[PDB]
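Hi D.,

Good news: the full-assembly prediction came through. Inputs first.
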Amino acid sequence: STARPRIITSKAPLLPQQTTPEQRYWRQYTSAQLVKEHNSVTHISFNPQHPHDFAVTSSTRVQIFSSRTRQVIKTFSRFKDVVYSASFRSDGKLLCAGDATGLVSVYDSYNPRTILLSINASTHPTHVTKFHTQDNKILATASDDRVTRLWDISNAYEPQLELTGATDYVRTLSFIPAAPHLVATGSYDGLIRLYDTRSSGSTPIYSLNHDQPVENVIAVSPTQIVSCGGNNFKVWDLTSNKKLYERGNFNKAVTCLDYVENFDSPMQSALIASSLDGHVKVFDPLDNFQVKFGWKFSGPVLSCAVSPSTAQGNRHLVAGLSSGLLAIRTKKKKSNNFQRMMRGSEYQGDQEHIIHNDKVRSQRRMRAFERNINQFKWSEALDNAFVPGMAKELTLTVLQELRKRGKVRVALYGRDESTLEPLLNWCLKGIEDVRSASIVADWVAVVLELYGNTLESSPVLQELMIDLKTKVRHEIHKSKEAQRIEGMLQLLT
Amino acid sequence: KDLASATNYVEGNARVTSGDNFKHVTATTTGTVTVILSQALQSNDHSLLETVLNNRDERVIRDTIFRLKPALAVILLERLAERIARQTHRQGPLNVWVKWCLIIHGGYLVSIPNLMSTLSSLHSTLKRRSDLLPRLLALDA
Amino acid sequence: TLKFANNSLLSGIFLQEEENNESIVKILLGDITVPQQAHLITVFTNNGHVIVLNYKGKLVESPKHFKISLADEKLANVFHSEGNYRILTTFKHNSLQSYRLYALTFDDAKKQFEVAHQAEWHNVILSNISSNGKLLAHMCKDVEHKSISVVSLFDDSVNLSFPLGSILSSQTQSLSYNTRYVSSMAIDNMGQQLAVGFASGVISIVSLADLQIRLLKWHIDSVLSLSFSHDGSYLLSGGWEKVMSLWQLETNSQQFLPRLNGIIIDCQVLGPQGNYYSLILQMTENNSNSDYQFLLLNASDLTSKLSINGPLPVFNSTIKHIQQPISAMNTKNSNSITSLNHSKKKQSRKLIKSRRQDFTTNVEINPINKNLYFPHISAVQIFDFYKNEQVNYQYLTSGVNNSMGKVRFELNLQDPIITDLKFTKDGQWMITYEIEYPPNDLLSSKDLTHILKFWTKNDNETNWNLKTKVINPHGISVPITKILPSPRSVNNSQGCLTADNNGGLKFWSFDSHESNWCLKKISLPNFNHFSNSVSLAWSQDGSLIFHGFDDKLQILDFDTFKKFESLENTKTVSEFTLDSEIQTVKLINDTNLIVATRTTLNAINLLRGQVINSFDLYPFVNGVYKNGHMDRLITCDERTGNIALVINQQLTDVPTINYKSRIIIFDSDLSTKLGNFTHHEYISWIGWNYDTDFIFLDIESTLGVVGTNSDIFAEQLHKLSS
Amino acid sequence: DYVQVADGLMVNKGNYTLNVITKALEDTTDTSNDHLDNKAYTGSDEFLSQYKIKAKAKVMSIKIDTKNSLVIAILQNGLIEIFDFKLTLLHSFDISYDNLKYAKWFTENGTEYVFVLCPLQDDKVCYKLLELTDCGSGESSPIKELSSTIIEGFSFENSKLCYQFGKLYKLNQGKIYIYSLPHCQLQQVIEFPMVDKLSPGDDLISFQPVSVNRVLLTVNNVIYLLDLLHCSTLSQRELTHVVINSEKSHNSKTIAIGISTKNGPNPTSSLEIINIDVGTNTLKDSLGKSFQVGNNDSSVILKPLFDDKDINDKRVKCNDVSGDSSVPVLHCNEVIEKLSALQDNDITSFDDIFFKELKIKEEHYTEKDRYISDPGFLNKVLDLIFGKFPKTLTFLLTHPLFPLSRTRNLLSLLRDQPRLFKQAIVTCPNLPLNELLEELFSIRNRELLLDISFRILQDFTRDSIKQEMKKLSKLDVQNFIEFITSGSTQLFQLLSLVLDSIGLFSLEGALLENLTLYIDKQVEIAERNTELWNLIALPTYTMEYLDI
RNA sequence: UGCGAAAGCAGUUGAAGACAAGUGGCUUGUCGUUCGUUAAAAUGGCCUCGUCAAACGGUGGAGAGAGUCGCUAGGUGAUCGUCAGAUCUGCCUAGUCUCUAUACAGCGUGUUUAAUUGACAUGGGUUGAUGCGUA
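Then the structure:
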């Protein structure tokens, strides 16, 4: 003898635009927070090491938020002009911020009162400041001087290397994630230059011609880097100096990018992109940078980031808008005498020769319609169908199980006016859908076959039959006009 | 479980599909809304796509699709097909859009090489809408 | 396994091409020849041979058989007790049999058993014998109605009789005939009580000393089997629900065992303490064959210790005096209380007079592990034939197949039929096609559903997993006449090609990106004629497809999936109209292809583009198989030839119920009949396992194949410590 | 087993090069080349050369001269390189190697001492093999394969100077013993009609096949298992098939003995010394669909009649499934003799042709299934009645009831008798849809319209109807719409076909509004009779009466 | 029942004998009876082996639910009123707008492409339904 097969929920052929695993995962980022800033949020970085805090650069202050309360734990307000960039070191121990007066100031993180050193860079505004990702004691600052600088933070008087060569407004750095001698910089003339730092450094080894003025350049692999600027982003193989993908799925200019790897996700890698029209989108680097999910925000989105790869807790997607506000969407995560008497209940057979196992697994709880179909209470199963809190596929599957299994007539025999009105009042709603309407058709046909006299007596289901008639009239106009559209594009083959 | 006990039937997470998804191979006109529609379809903007196709004046729809670029009438038709597949009460108002896209762009999507493969979702939606027409004929009789 | 046909010792008892009524009717555990010394069994057959056979070690090459001095009688059974032996015999008005009991002796001349003739019973309707074999009850039909008589056979301890109107109620005489028809009876080891199970569903324990009855009503359809325990305080019953109940006769309390994959047509306790129940399960979802599962089970936890079954095919028609068992109503799975005699007369007349005598089935071979997959009704029996025992059984449709024992009205519902299943050529996927039938008397009762399912397993687990299903492939209400798995060159042997009766084709293939088996290619023509004489073949290269629709063998390519074309017109013949609708387009290798149609059997080369050979089929296979079953009647190889197969229903001095099979092989485009074999029984399916053999399935399901000091201390210690 | 048949030194270049093929010349000084221009210098010429190759550099070129050695040339720059003589007998077929791939000092006389591709690099002396008349070089593991007229096969590998295998191959005087296309075999042609493939790793024959006809200049192509062959006194270069990723279409091999057939690509016009015309332009051998085109090397058709399963005690046949008969007495001699009995002076009568056919085939004279027949036999008797004699009432009624009529049906509109024409509409089982559409749109306004629309719907696919009913005028379709609107199911879907196949825009308006009104009322009546087909207690006080 | 396609297309439904009931016959009905024809009901339903809670991975969704009288399109009502139109800030539907633990559904996590842990002495005894009201 077997166990009883479970009642299989009636699944129809799948409709278009189903819920992909990528968009289910990215759709459980919810409970949005909107924090109004004093000015447009230009940059946002995350702590790498305990990857659980993030710094938001508004105008003339940098606020570190926590990734468990989403309130400002700490804030950095002693800047003279607009602070532009603020990033954490790879050890997460200190925080660099480039400022509109060309004064890079690096504090230590989680202590806003101890400014550790103030590199006086160019007289022009310094727009991007980030530490090396391999090395710890070098900091790369590009400014509106069309020259980036590598500074050793011990010798903070002269820059240890001066990467010039770009004709207009260098706004982004990036480091290549396995070769630590390799700095890719990006400017408003297009032309991602990139430099070997053992060489002279006043000339790039090559240049990648993004045609639009680039807004950001990040590095995905040790080999391929992604530059956004203009309406698209392009990806570039770096061992072969050559473009290989470009996605232009926006309306306005892509402002920023960042990238995730190895995190707990159906997507093994994810590049998300923020694009001055409200949209932030996530692209999957493994199937050809195809877009998988997106968010629309209440204004032009200027910068975005996500929690880093090892977040281990409450996971965040943050987007700062040009409107001057900040949007966070997170996904969350008896007696010693009595115990000495009941000691052994946690042993589970380690030193024991034979280990027997016949405890059956406890299956899912049966719903009332399923146990009534099991107990052969077929009219009670119909009654349990037409309760209000039932799913539409559950009402459909108990109708289909009574149709295939036994008898519609058995399920409908002892009824009268007051006990048929649930069925017909659901058949009004079920006649609209394609997946239900065959079952609704034969159930209504059987109930008017064997209750044609109650039709005469009760007037308060006559009107239900009339409403059902106008419903089938609307549906038959729809099923006729669908055949007309089917013919009118059969003509166009 | 017993060795004579038969294996029960269980679908599990099997994808149930139909046999019809072929997914594999000066001014003087009006004030329309087609710039809105065009830069709804260049991206995938469901929000302002909804605000452009909740307009339901027939002449506005007509010359909007007339002023539309014919390289993206196929993706406007794909969006309309998926929306009437999902929401069934939209089939009334939205198929006014799909009959005008075929009438106006009657050359582009007859010169396209795979019509059914490119707008499969429309074919599957209309096939499942019009397949059951004898059944509700018998029902209303 | 003591094979009968292995040796002339008892294949000389039966190897006949016409006579299989020689049957094996009882096995006894002792040795009837010499007493007091047992590891060997004495089998009594239904004619009168008594063979003594050793089943410990090798079978002896000359058994101890005898032949008892018997009249025209035909050996109902034998009976054992302490020492003595009885036998019972059947006879020659109203068609009833007649029974006669003898006693045996052996000793004086050791060739013959002498008999004694205790008594007779001159009209018997139904009979049963107690568990110890100490007494037996039966029915009489002696006038206004029948009668019931119990008799101890190994002694004149008791013999009583009474008309069963004193058993029956007063309500039953004004009710239907099911309320007074009796389909079961049983007695206990004392003869104090007796269980009469009626066709209406009730059971009644009469107390034989005073004829007071007790009614037990649980079975909602007919009661088919009853047994008592040894002490007589528990009654096992089984019926048309697949639920074995056991009635605690003290408190009238049932214990159930509900889903037993077959109706219980016999149940009995078995052990000395009654620790086993043995059951016979009739498995009546297929009406074309009576296929019984033997299932004992230990009584402790009610788990199936040693379930036994043969191969279970479903033939296209009913076979040979097959009667679906009795019930309350006349259904499509049973027959009512009246129609058994008329049904067996009609079935004999159908086998005699009629013309469509095709009862052929489809069997598949899993190309990985060489076990064969009989698709039962809504299920498959996976069965390996190098030990002829079932691997397992699996439900592949969504019916009420397992959840419920259907009864009197509900037996007019059928679970979906699996009509095609084919494995992909690497054995990784199983394609199956099923027809889902609707219940009658509603609006959708005349439109079927057609479901094509795709199953997967790794090479360890015994049961498959549904990865995808497409309901209505090819469109609504249109069937699939033929599915064909694809060779190893299209999508690494992961494609299937399904054919309509419109001549439409759909190529489905599994791609890993969207991790599912999806619809790749399509060629639909929209005709207004339909025919299920559709066949399909593929080039081994994976380049061109031979679509053998009716009267027409189209040639499609694979790249554009339309009819084949070369612009140079190098006699590009891409259609072959033949004299009748074609039912096999089997291409042996990439040179040539054998077409078989209902008149002729052609062969066509393509490196020399014309007909090379032809044969005559119409005198043999005329209007006898349904159009689409020659594909399962003939088959091929991958190197070494092709196999035709015809059937001759034998004759008297009119056709009869007897058959013979003429199978023939050809090598290398119909050149030589290098195999001309004749089998003694109807043959139903033949197919090539993937290592140069051809297996075939007999109509009584025998799978056959066409191939190419210290020593005495040790002995006495193993004696005395065992 | 042929291919697409038409067209009656660096070995991997093409055009856009200067001269990557510099070769010797018959009855000339030594050698030459041409362009579609590289210099023709000397490789120490003026000897008895029979072929010429290079080191795959074209400025390290040579003249492979019959003097036991060879030197380098300067065909681009002017700077020569040095050399060193090994033998002095015959090095006319010298083949310089790549960077250490396959080279040895074998000139002509069994002295195959191994060396490298250099002027002073040496190796072992692998002259162990006997006097070989067919020494080739392949890339199994780069190897000299010797076939000797002392007859014996041997295979040495010039990778470590290692004799891989060798046996006794009894090869006679050959025509072309060329290595295979994948190199795994040796295609050696016998003189007139044969080409055998031998296993060139073990020196044994693997498949000895015959060929189609006369062919002399044969060599394996850059294919899977295919060769090209030019006729001896013919410019016909045919192809046969007994590289697999994206194969060759031209510039495969240059070995031919035609009218100076040097540098043989597909378009082989601009030769290296010849300046000839060109031919076929196909690719190499495909998988299996081109062998339905090249269905050659077998032309042995006879008259195939239906045989029978051989009567080995056929008297126990056990209830044959026919009506009354058991087996038709086959008379193929009488089938052939019925042609002589029919082609007679019954030039307008059915006394010596129709009675002859119905006596040779005793049927009901409108029915199949008492077959024993051949398509050539039916075609020849149909030719004999299409000659001096449709006025027969039995023969040309019982044989459009035959599924082998073979395309002599085109005049079925061109002759017009009512009963024979309707019978050829219904039952003639191969009909041209061109004539069917002409008969359909040449309307006589009758029920034969329904009978022709039936067959045009029930044996042709809808798109093959549409593409060949584009081939109509507009008066036909306007009168067709007018006749449908005037005065059924198959013609409704035929009307759907004509509306799908007329096109999109070029219509008129009044006919369209008339058709719109007609089909509006047609859908209304179809809806109402579909509705018709789908359409097929006690009170408290009474007062009644009873009997008095 | 036969031919069929899944539609449909042709064919029907006799005789003997026995028994039962009703009034030796006559009527009616049955048949663990034969020959010929291709031919609804006996109150009578499916076992235990461990539940509960919280996750996680795929699969579907008509989404489970709540607002804004915010827009678009409608269907319609009470009373008065010649209509015009008034008040009910008229009601209902669908779409849009906004938000939530994707709230909904289902399969699985014993090995699987993937994905699980934890509570509880899994007993016995006494009330517990006539002790209860927020309606």
